[PDB]
Structure formats: C-alpha cells, structure tokens
Design a protein around this ligand. Structure first.
Ligand SMILES: O=C(Cc1cccc(Cl)c1)Nc1cnccc1C1CC1
Ligand SMILES: O=C(Cc1cccc(Cl)c1)Nc1cnccc1C1CC1
Lengths: 304, 304
C-alpha cells in the first residue's frame, strides 16, 4: 500500500547524457548510438535569441565547433544536421551504454519521467505530465536545456520529450526527439501564449481509483451519473470532457474495485461541486491529474 | 523556475540491486563490494513471522540456501551473518558497478530517495522523508523488502534506509544499513504503534522560501513573530518546535529572499490559523514538509 508520484528508474538515461558546447553556450545532449541530440539553440548567443535564423546561424558552424563531452571524455564530431528544432551531431563512437530505445510523441494527458541535467550531469528525476495545453510543469533552470522525458517498457526507453524553453509564466516547453515542439511554441525569446489548461479528467478518476485501493474511501457516495451529466460538470470546472475511450481505459480499475466508472464520476462531480471540506485524498488536498490509469495499475501491481 | 518532489538519479543504486531467495521467500538485496545486504526475514516462512527466533532460524540455513541473482547471473555465497535485522551474504565476486558509498543513519525530518524494487529489479524512484515518528510514507508492495533509500553527494551514495515492513496503518518501517530499525519497530507480524507524527516545521518553512523564489508570494504578510510565540502555534497544530538550529539552517534561504526567518514563521502561523482559503502554494493545497532547506537550495541552484 501507499501511493507516490513515482518516476521510472533513471539509469538507462543517465548513461546517455552528455554535455554539448558551441560558441559560448552549453546545454545537455542525448547520446544514443553514434548520434548526439540536443536543442538547436545551442548555436545561438543572447543577441540572436530574439529572432534567430537557425539555418543561417548553423551555416557559420563546422563539426569542430560542437564540443561534445561524455563524462570527462571528448567525443569527435563527424557530422551535424538540423531536424526541426534539434541538432543531430554524428559522433565517431557509438554510446556503449545505449539502451533499447524508441522515439515517441506522447499525447496530452500522458505522463513521463524527466531526468533534469546540467552540463551533461544528472541532478534529479521527477514524474510529470504533458498538460492538455502542451506545456509541462517541470523544475528547470538555465543549463537544463536538452534534459529529456521518457517512459520504460521492461528494457526499452521511449524518449518522448526534450526540454527547450521556459515560458515567462514559469511553465516549460519542449520538443519530441525529432525536434517538433509540443504545442504552438517556437524556440525564440518572445512572449508566447501557453493557452488555457484543463484538468485531465481520466487521470483524476484513475487517482480516485488508486485512493480506493489504498484505503481512502471517504469520497465514495450513494450516487451515479451519466457521461452527458458528468460532462456538464467537467465543462464548468475546466476539466477535459470524458469519453467512452476514457471509460474503457478505466475498466481494469473499475473491475478491481467493483466501483462502476460512472459511479466514480459521481464521486468526482460531488468533489468538484463541494470541494474536499478540509479533508485529504492520498495525502493531497487537491484533485491530482498526473497519474494515468496505466500509472495507477503499474504502481498498484509493482511492474518492473 | 518550477518546484518538484525531485528524487536523486537512481542509476548508481540500480547497479547494486539483486534478488535474494531463501526457502520459499524472495526479496531484494543490495550488492556493494563482495557483500549482499537484505532484510533478515528472508529466512522466514509465514508461520514463524508471528514470533520468529532469527538466531534459531538462521542456524538451519547454510550459504548454499541463499540464492543471490544479479540480473540473470547467479552469485556464489561464501559467507552469511546476521547484523541486527539484516543479513550480510558474502559473495565471491565484488560488484563491478559498486559506486563510492557510505552507510548513514539519517535524522527524523531528513529526506531521501527510494528505489522501489521487486525480484531484484527496479520499478520506480520517489522522494520521501523520515517522519518524526520514524516511519516513511512510501509506496511498497509485497516483494519490495530490501528496497533502499539513499542520498547522493557528487559521486558518493549514502545509503540510509532498507525497507522491511508494512504497518497495519499502511505506513512503512525499515532499518539503516546496519540492520537497526528506525523507530521502535521489530521485524514481527504483530500490530505495532507508529506513534504520533508531527509536521517538520523547518521543512515547511524551507518550502515556503522555495515558493517565494518561484513566484508564489500571496501568503507573505506584514507581520513578524518570535520563536516562543511561533512555538505556541506549532504546538497547537502538531508541528515540531522550531529552534535556533532550524533558523540557522534557514539562513541561506533567508539571505536569498531578504525575508527574515521569523517573518516567514509569521506567514506560517497565519497559514496554520487561517488555512489556504482555497488557494495553492507550488501546486499544493496543503503545507508540504518533505523538502529540507538543503533540498530547496539544491533544487533552486541545480546541484549535480
Ligand atoms: O528558456 C531558456 C532559454 C531559451 C530562450 C528562448 C528560447 C529557447 Cl528555445 C530557449 N532556457 C531555460 C529553460 N528552462 C528553464 C530555465 C531556462 C532559462 C531562462 C532561465
Ligand atoms: O510487511 C511485509 C512483510 C513483513 C511482515 C512482518 C514483519 C516484517 Cl519485517 C515483514 N512486507 C511488505 C512491505 N511493504 C509493503 C507490503 C508488504 C507486504 C504486506 C504486503
């Protein structure tokens, strides 16, 4: 028993972290096979971060200008190319610590682990979610660019995120591993609209099922609702509309607890309309939406 | 900017995790040098977990009865001994992945990372604190015994905790790496009093300083207090008494924000007496006490 914001073990990713320097800028790189991936703004100075012409800036750079250090050893750069907002630096040595990996583009509402890094060295690991507005609420400082988000299926690391930018709001923006930004963001020093964020309803419901599994049952009531009635409530409280695809994914959690999905939606409705009343659920005084139904099953069953 | 319950990167510890089987029981071991450390209840069956005589039970066991598997390779056991509530199994091979390590006994209120493990394989990592009542609120299932808690100083892993037991309350109990239980707990299947827990005042105050650093300032007021006045309030709300040693550790955070420690205690007093009023601080609707002043400085400065 017990329920925690659990991140994946970071070892397979720690072995891929390198430091990338170019000009006077240093950030993190991801060394998989003979390629180092890093945010393309490594080639920029503060003056051109206002409106950078990356193609033109990259033209003034040669392989020898990209200094890639793996721990305390220098990697030799034999090729460079820009794919969207990332640079791929071909190195002459394949990373001996490359795990089985995939590059995936996660959906909004999905969760992943982040290994925050500075100068190619890991400082910490935390679990977070891709918000519906395609931002992440991470913990990142200057130098953290190139830090990656990932998931692990048995031995395979699915890299889903690379950190690029901090918004003026303090929220974070970044790309998938092909350099495509999640959301409308562009790698420019210009104020950019994050957009209205919503609460991931299916995730809150999964966390309510985790709460029942771990003894917290005060919020369960004698009521039920329909998808249409519940969605009127979700709309009012800026919660994502619940669909039958959401209910289907909540099936395993419903079967384990014997609480029908719509019965749990009625508990959520009452919690939204009435609040917690000074009570807690799994040590939280607010409704948590950063655990997917898969996360809850995984944590509650001990999948390694 | 941003503030997260950040755990240490788990790689150096993942390389030390092994599976220990004895009789019909399997749990996790910690392989450092030529020694495997694991909870001594690995030698027990369900019948003798009611009142085990570990010395007598261990007598019926030989080196060949302890099956230690590191990944998919079998380690040869050449010695066994009991030190308090842990067994130390001498193996014929030193772990090639042993990091620089120390065995430390943490103080209540101190935090550490846990690498939850099942069958010698890591499933996840989370940050937690040794509660003032010497329990931890972890996330552990059957088979998680032997999972360890640790801290990292540059390259040195300070192992502070080994998981042993789940209390009937769902809270967790365990030992330091010499087998000494934190708290009054004994490795027996008997109901055991956890004791009254308190809120780690110095940690809440550190988290309030992290909140100011990351823009959250609504809770700051035009008041100040004294250690004696504040401690009357802390007593009423089951908060640990604040001492000058606590204030001294809060010095770096006070200097960075220009908010005197007693001024921040007045904000805490008002928050305890008035509540959050439906507001949040760093995405939390309750006062967080699982970040030490050291944790806040580390996260807010990017120490790798
Ligand atoms: O945001 C940037 C630099 C930057 C500026 C403009 C565009 C792009 Cl792609 C990147 N880095 C960063 C990331 N995460 C957290 C803190 C920071 C630094 C501000 C402190
Ligand atoms: O508590 C035990 C077994 C046990 C019983 C009595 C004494 C001792 Cl030292 C150990 N293991 C465990 C640990 N953490 C979480 C879940 C569990 C299992 C109950 C599900």
């Amino acid at each position: 028993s017990g329920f925690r914001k659990m991140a994946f073990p970071s070892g397979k990713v720690e072995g891929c972290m390198v430091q990338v320097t170019c000009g006077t800028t240093t950030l993190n790189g991801l060394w998989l096979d003979d390629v180092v991936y890093c945010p393309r703004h490594v080639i920029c100075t503060s003056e051109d971060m206002l409106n950078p012409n990356y193609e033109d800036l990259l033209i003034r750079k040669s392989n020898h200008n990209f200094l890639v250090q793996a721990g305390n050893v220098q990697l030799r750069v034999i090729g460079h190319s820009m794919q969207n907002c990332v640079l791929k630096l071909k190195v002459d040595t394949a990373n001996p610590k490359t795990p089985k990996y995939k590059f995936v583009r996660i959906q909004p509402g999905q969760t992943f682990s982040v290994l925050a890094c500075y100068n190619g060295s890991p400082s910490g690991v935390y679990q977070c979610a891709m918000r519906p507005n395609f931002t992440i609420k991470g913990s990142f400082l200057n130098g953290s660019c190139g830090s990656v988000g990932f998931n692990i299926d048995y031995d395979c690391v699915s890299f889903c995120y690379m950190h690029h930018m901090e918004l003026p709001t303090g929220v974070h923006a970044g790309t998938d591993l092909e350099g495509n930004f999640y959301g409308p963001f562009v790698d420019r020093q210009t104020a950019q609209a994050a957009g209205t964020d919503t609460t991931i309803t299916v995730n809150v419901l999964a966390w309510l099922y985790a709460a029942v599994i771990n003894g917290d049952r005060w919020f369960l009531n004698r009521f039920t609702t329909t998808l249409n009635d519940f969605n009127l409530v979700a709309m009012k409280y800026n919660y994502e509309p619940l669909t039958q695809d959401h209910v289907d994914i909540l099936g395993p959690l419903s079967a384990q607890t014997g609480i029908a999905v719509l019965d749990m939606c009625a508990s959520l409705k009452e919690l939204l309309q009435n609040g917690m009343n000074g009570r807690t659920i799994l040590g939280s005084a607010l409704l948590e939406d950063e655990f997917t139904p898969f996360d809850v099953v995984r944590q509650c069953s001990g999948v390694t």
